[PDB]
Amino acid sequence: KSWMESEFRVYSSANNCTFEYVSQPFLMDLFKNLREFVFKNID
Amino acid sequence: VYAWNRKRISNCVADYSVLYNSASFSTFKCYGVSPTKLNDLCFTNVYADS
Numbered sequence A: 001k002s003w004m005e006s007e008f009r010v011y012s013s014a015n016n017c018t019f020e021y022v023s024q025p026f027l028m029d030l031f032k033n034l035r036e037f038v039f040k041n042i043d
Numbered sequence B: 001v002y003a004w005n006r007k008r009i010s011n012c013v014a015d016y017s018v019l020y021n022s023a024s025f026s027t028f029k030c031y032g033v034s035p036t037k038l039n040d041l042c043f044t045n046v047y048a049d050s
């Protein structure tokens, strides 16, 4: 009685990785909510 | 050796003092840097070739 992710097809290959970081594992829940994000690429 | 494994290490606190005193090393030679200075040095990336 709960959705479970089973498909991830985004990149065919991954070679010469230049960074990797994984946060701590958790559970995502599968009236609204607003998620705002600011992405800045500097220096 | 022909397929030597390489691990990329970044974005972490390297513990040189504990690492160098963990096991028994029959050979330990550093070039361009002292083993005890690494605790005070910062680097962009590390490559561990085993």
Ligand SMILES: *[C@@H]1O[C@H](CO)[C@@H](O)[C@H](O)[C@H]1NC(C)=O
Pocket (backbone or CB within 6 Å): A015, A016
């Ligand atoms: C990954 O880097 C090596 C040398 O650093 C290079 O020979 C190789 O072509 C690179 N991989 C790709 C897919 O370009």
